[PDB]
Amino acid sequence: ELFTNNALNLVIIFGSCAALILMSFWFRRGNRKRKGFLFHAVQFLIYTIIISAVGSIINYVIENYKLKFITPGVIDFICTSLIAV
Amino acid sequence: ELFTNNALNLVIIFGSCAALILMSFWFRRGNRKRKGFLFHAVQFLIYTIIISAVGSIINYVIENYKLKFITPGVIDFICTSLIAV
Numbered sequence: 001e002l003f004t005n006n007a008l009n010l011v012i013i014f015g016s017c018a019a020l021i022l023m024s025f026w027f028r029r030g031n032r033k034r035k036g037f038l039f040h041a042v043q044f045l046i047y048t049i050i051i052s053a054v055g056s057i058i059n060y061v062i063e064n065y066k067l068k069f070i071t072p073g074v075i076d077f078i079c080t081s082l083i084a085v
Numbered sequence: 086e087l088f089t090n091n092a093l094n095l096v097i098i099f100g101s102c103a104a105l106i107l108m109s110f111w112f113r114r115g116n117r118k119r120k121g122f123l124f125h126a127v128q129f130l131i132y133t134i135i136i137s138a139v140g141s142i143i144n145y146v147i148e149n150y151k152l153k154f155i156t157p158g159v160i161d162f163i164c165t166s167l168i169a170v
Binding site: 007008009010011060 | 153154155
């Protein structure tokens with residue numbers, strides 16, 4: 001249920017909220033409007049974290065609930081493919 | 086409880102106290118005020134020890150008590166990331 005999902009989510013929702021806060025800060029680029037090189041790189045890094053969090057979610061969704069026929073191999077492959085892209 | 090936590094902590098608290106004593110000694114730099122190069126390096130080393138001690142703690146906190154959803158992989162990854170940083 002909702003309570004079980006929130007409990008098993010752990011700090012994945014916290015990680016997503018932190019990523020959203022980081023994106024909001026990047027909207028002003030921290031202090032003044034300036035982007036380029038490293039400003040992108042760190043963003044890429046945090047993007048990976050989000051995907052990792054998503055992975056955890058798409059784990060616990062299929063762990064406590066019905067296993068279905070998704071398997072973790074294809075989802076981790078998709079995560080790596082998105083990161084590379 | 087407090088007694089169980091103190092027992093399972095072992096010498097981790099002792100390691101933290103030794104690290105605090107080393108930091109206090111470094112405040113006077115041993116004998117006279119002088120810092121540079123090696124004075125930092127050894128400090129870095131002891132810093133790692135502290136993190137290791139912290140790891141042990143964040144182990145036994147989630148071992149005897151509720152497992153929760155923290156997992157040891159992310160905490161060791163965070164320890165290594167902090168050491169590298």
